[PDB]
Amino acid sequence: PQVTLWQRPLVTIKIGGQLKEALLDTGADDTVLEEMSLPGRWKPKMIVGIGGFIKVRQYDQILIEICGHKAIGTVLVGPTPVNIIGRNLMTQIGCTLNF
Amino acid sequence: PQVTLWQRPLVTIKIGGQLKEALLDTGADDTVLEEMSLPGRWKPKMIVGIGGFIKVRQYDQILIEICGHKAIGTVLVGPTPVNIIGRNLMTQIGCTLNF
Ligand SMILES: CC(C)(C)NC(=O)[C@@H]1C[C@@H]2CCCC[C@@H]2CN1C[C@@H](O)[C@H](Cc1ccccc1)NC(=O)[C@H](CC(N)=O)NC(=O)c1ccc2ccccc2n1
Numbered sequence: 001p002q003v004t005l006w007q008r009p010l011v012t013i014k015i016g017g018q019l020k021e022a023l024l025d026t027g028a029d030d031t032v033l034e035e036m037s038l039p040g041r042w043k044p045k046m047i048v049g050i051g052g053f054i055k056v057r058q059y060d061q062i063l064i065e066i067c068g069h070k071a072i073g074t075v076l077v078g079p080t081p082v083n084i085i086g087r088n089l090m091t092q093i094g095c096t097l098n099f
Numbered sequence: 100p101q102v103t104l105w106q107r108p109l110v111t112i113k114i115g116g117q118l119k120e121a122l123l124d125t126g127a128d129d130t131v132l133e134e135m136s137l138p139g140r141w142k143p144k145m146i147v148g149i150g151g152f153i154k155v156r157q158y159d160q161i162l163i164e165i166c167g168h169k170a171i172g173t174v175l176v177g178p179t180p181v182n183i184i185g186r187n188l189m190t191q192i193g194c195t196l197n198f
Binding site: 001002003004005006008009023024025026027028029032047048049050051052053054067080084087090091093094095096097098099 | 100101102103104105107108122123124125126127128131146147148149150151152153166179183186189190192193194195196197198
């Protein structure tokens with residue numbers, strides 16, 4: 001459906017057997033979730049945003065359901081004040097901007 | 100038109116008599132442009148993103164053309180590595196996410 005932007009575009013994702021709210025971020029290249037326990041092997045990684053860098057744990061081949069749509073991809077876990085769904089998973093579910 | 104997200108959603112804006120590329124960011128509450136000269140009176144402001152805070156100059160009632168669509172609103176100028184069009188101006192031009 002058409003999600004307008006008067007308020008933040010938040011949605012519910014299910015990942016790691018848990019339900020969470022997340023922000024559909026067309027400006028985030030990656031998907032970054034708050035600290036949590038995930039099944040798998042991870043690598044350290046450094047990412048950067050407006051204020052500088054944060055170190056996150058990279059997870060690959062993670063199944064994540066975004067509003068009921070299964071998607072598999074790389075998830076970054078770390079100190080983000082808010083769970084962010086980046087363009088990587090959004091393209092998989094078919095999201096897009098309308099102008 | 101429907102802007103997909105395989106690559107970054109960049110567009111051309113015209114502001115301050117100049118043409119610039121900017122990112123359509125559904126995850127940014129505000130609009131933040133790289134340091135530039137703007138016509139007006141400004142207030143200092145602190146904003147925060149993934150890595151922490153940055154101090155920006157707030158400008159109000161600024162006319163900014165996004166891909167030819169005039170919009171008037173508050174612009175934040177400061178040390179951002181990339182010009183960001185936030186949800187504030189996007190709602191004015193009628194942008195929205197399609198799921
Ligand atoms: C997540 C990551 C992969 C690191 N990518 C990014 O962070 C990219 C980096 C890009 C290049 C540098 C300039 C910014 C763009 C867009 N950002 C995405 C971009 O969408 C980013 C996502 C975000 C949201 C909340 C908190 C942190 C980060 N938004 C922001 O940084 C905007 C800044 C603004 N416009 O006011 N912040 C917020 O709108 C915002 C909202 C709620 C908050 C709650 C607590 C703390 C901070 C909060 N910040």
